[PDB]
Structure formats: C-alpha cells, structure tokens
Design a binder for this molecule. Structure first.
Ligand SMILES: C[C@H](CCCC(C)(C)O)[C@H]1CC[C@H]2[C@@H]3CC=C4C[C@@H](O)CC[C@]4(C)[C@H]3CC[C@]12C
Lengths: 238, 182
C-alpha cells in the first residue's frame, strides 16, 4: 500500500533533520556508545584457521571498499565504515552484559563471523544512491532524495535478516542462541548508528566537496575505539 | 593458432588455480576437524585420497558451471562480485567449523540446521533456479562414492553431504566470477 511513500516521506524528513545540524548527532552517538561500553572494562593446530579467517576478513574489507569508492568521496570513508561496524559490535556486547549474560565464547574468534554477517553493503548501497543524485541545486536535499529512494530496500533487507536470526534463535542449541542474540543486537545498532552518523558524515563530506571537516574527528575517535577494541579482543582469546 | 591457444590456456590456468585453492581448503578444514585427538607433520595427514579428490572436484565444478550457462543461456547477474565470493568462503569455513567444535543432543538438529543453513546461503549468494540442481547432484555423487570406498551412525553420514553441496556452490560461484573476469 501507500505505506512505503509514507515511510519515505517521514524518512525523507528525517534526512532533512539528519543534515540540518550534524554535530549534536555526533556528540550524542559518541556519548551513547561510550556509556554502553563503560561496563565492558570495569566488569599450532588451533591457530591456522583463525588467522586465515582474519585474512579473509581484511581482504573482504579492502575489496568492498575498492568497489565502494565513488567520485567526491575520500578514502577515509571506509575507515569510518570500519569504525561503524566495530562500534556497533561493541554496543552489543557491553549492552548484553547489562541484562545478564554468560560470556562462554571468545569474542576474539567470533568477531569475524559477526562482521561477515552484518556486512557493509547497507551503506554502500545508499552512497551509490545519493552520489547518483545530481551535483546541482542542493548539497543537503541531495542526500534527502538519495535516502528517500532506498528506504524500502533497506527495511526489506533488515526484515529478512531479522527473520533469519529469529529462526536461528529458534534452534534450541545454546551457543547459537547466544550468537543470534549478539547479531540481532549488532544489527539494530548498525541500523540506528548508520543512520545517525554515516548520514551526517556523508552530508558534511558532500558539503566540503561542493563548497570546495568532521572526517578528522570521526577518524580520530574511530581510531581510538579501534585500538580499544583490538585490546579488548587480544586479552580474552589467548 | 596462438590466439586460440590463449583462450584454451586461460581456461587451463583458471582451472589450475582453482585446483590449488581447493587443495589448500581441504587441507585447512581437515586440520580443523582433527583438533580433538611436528605441527607441519601433524597437519599433513590423510596423504592419499583427499587432496586429489577435493582439488579435482573443485576445478571441474568451476570449469563446468560457466560453460553450461554459456551453452544454455543467460549468464548470472547478482551480488556475484568479488566481495560476495570472499563472503561465501568465510561462511563456508564457519559452517565447516560448526561441524566439529560443537555437540548436539541428537542428529536431527544437526542435519536440519545444516540443510536450512546451506539453503539460506544459496538464497543469499546465488538465487539460480539451476545451481541447486548441480550442487545436489554432486553431493549425491561424492556421498555415495565415499560410502563405497569404505567397504574396504555418526557425522560420517550427516555433514559430508551438506558440506559437499556447499563446496560445490562456492566453487561454481568462484568459477563463474573468474569467468566474468574473461
Ligand atoms: C555464518 C553463519 C550465518 C550466516 C549464513 C546465513 C545464510 C544465515 O547468512 C553462522 C551461523 C552459525 C554460526 C556459528 C555458530 C556457533 C559457532 C561456535 C563458535 O565457537 C565458533 C563460530 C560458530 C561455529 C559460528 C560461525 C558462524 C556461523 C556458522
């Protein structure tokens, strides 16, 4: 029915909101992610497959970014992309520790499979949608239209992943119950943070491109967070 | 004649590389599944049957999918971009890993999980109305030939088939993509 249009309309309005002012959104997300992580710090045979898995990972990244690159977009975008997923992942675990969870598994080994599951397409799709939007009469309304045009595919893909992982949880085995939970939460976090952060940084990059500086703060914050994540991973699975 | 030789030997080298990748992969996964009982020497077990079978089956699968597509009809057009292929490989290892590092109360859970999983995979990385057919055919075949080479109730009868099928899909994908290369 007309639902999709309504979605787009309000979603498009949210775009007009997302870029009306970028900073508050950032500070908000940074504060929330940190306050979700807070608890995490205060509370040969077995090798080769793990390392090669990490290899597969790195190369997957390099590929989906080489393919991701588009005109008037800096390399650091992929860095932000990395940061996104990483931060989202963290928001999951530290939040799971809030309600009561038995951390039986090692995050160090799993993190790759998570990454692979939530993936990186759900941001390149929209970057392609928006950059295709002309480069004339708007810098903000540009992303507005670019976003309004992919809402339906976004939500459909999300609903499919939900169905998948719900089916997963419905397998009475515990390890996979736990994993499914981690993934669903990382998924919702990807949704929210992707919007709130990636939309705004794309807006400001397109502004600094057309008019011609948030990628610096995004990059630095994300590098600190990535160091913290490497640390949190290296000490639990060794 | 040199130009025709260029095409033929491009096909050749493609199958060769696929062969070597399949060797590597079987090696690794076998190393994985045996972690329950000279590290280089410890890895090099089962020196006779597996490296040839897995490698050659992989290479033939790869060579085969594109050529039947071409000599039948339209090629593929989907997420089949390098990225999705790497994704497939990683998921393949993950699923082969679940086979060993976990214990279930029964067999039905195992088999059903694995079937539904390979199903989801397929729908995710190739929605061909055809791929299913050849995947299941080769699964059938490898399963029965293994069942015969043992004339000379456990995982022996459960994960072999689904993993054969998944490996087939993955290899065929890699082949069609390396063909779309050229
Ligand atoms: C890659 C797939 C899901 C993605 C495939 C699909 C079709 C749903 O997209 C996931 C599903 C189940 C996951 C395993 C669950 C439990 C474990 C145990 C843990 O110790 C090691 C990782 C592992 C084997 C998970 C790997 C990723 C798996 C296969």
């Amino acid at each position: 029915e007309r639902l999709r249009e309504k979605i787009s309309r309000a979603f498009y309005n949210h775009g007009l909101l997302c870029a009306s002012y970028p900073i508050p959104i950032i500070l908000f997300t940074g504060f929330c992610i940190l306050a979700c992580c807070y608890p995490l710090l205060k509370l040969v045979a077995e090798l080769i497959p793990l390392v090669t898995t990490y290899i597969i990972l790195f190369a997957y990244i390099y590929f989906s970014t080489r393919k991701i690159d588009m005109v008037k977009s800096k390399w650091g975008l992929a860095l932000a992309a990395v940061v996104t997923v990483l931060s989202s992942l963290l928001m999951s675990v530290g939040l799971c520790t809030l309600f009561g969870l038995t951390p039986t598994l090692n995050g160090g080994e799993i993190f790759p499979y998570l990454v692979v599951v939530i993936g990186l397409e759900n941001v390149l799709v929209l970057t392609k949608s928006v950059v295709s939007t002309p480069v004339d009469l708007e810098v903000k309304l540009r992303i507005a239209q670019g976003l309004s045009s992919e809402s339906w595919s976004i939500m459909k893909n999300m609903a499919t992943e939900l169905g998948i992982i719900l089916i997963g949880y419905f397998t009475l085995v515990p390890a996979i119950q736990e994993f499914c939970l981690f993934a669903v939460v990382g998924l919702v976090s990807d949704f929210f943070l992707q919007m709130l952060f990636f939309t705004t940084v794309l807006s400001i990059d397109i502004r600094r491109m057309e008019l011609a500086r948030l990628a610096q703060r995004l990059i630095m914050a994300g590098t600190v967070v990535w160091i913290g994540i490497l640390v949190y991973t290296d000490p639990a699975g060794l | 004649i040199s130009s025709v030789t260029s095409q033929s030997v491009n096909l050749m080298i493609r199958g060769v590389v696929l062969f070597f990748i399949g060797v590597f992969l079987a090696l690794v996964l076998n190393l994985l599944q045996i972690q329950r009982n000279d590290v280089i020497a410890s890895i090099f077990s089962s020196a006779w049957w597996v490296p040839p079978c897995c490698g050659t089956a992989s290479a033939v699968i790869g060579l085969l999918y594109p050529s039947i597509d071409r000599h039948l009809g339209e090629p593929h057009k989907f997420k089949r971009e390098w990225s999705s292929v790497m994704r497939c490989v990683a998921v393949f290892v993950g699923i082969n890993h679940a086979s060993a590092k976990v214990d279930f109360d029964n067999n039905i859970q195992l088999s059903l999980t694995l079937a539904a999983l390979s199903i989801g995979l397929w729908w995710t990385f190739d929605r061909s109305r055809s791929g299913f057919g050849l995947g299941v055919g080769i699964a059938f075949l490898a399963t029965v030939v293994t069942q015969l080479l043992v004339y000379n109730f456990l995982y022996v009868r459960s994960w072999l088939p689904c993993i054969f099928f998944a490996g087939g899909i993955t290899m065929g994908n890699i082949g069609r993509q390396l063909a779309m290369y050229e």
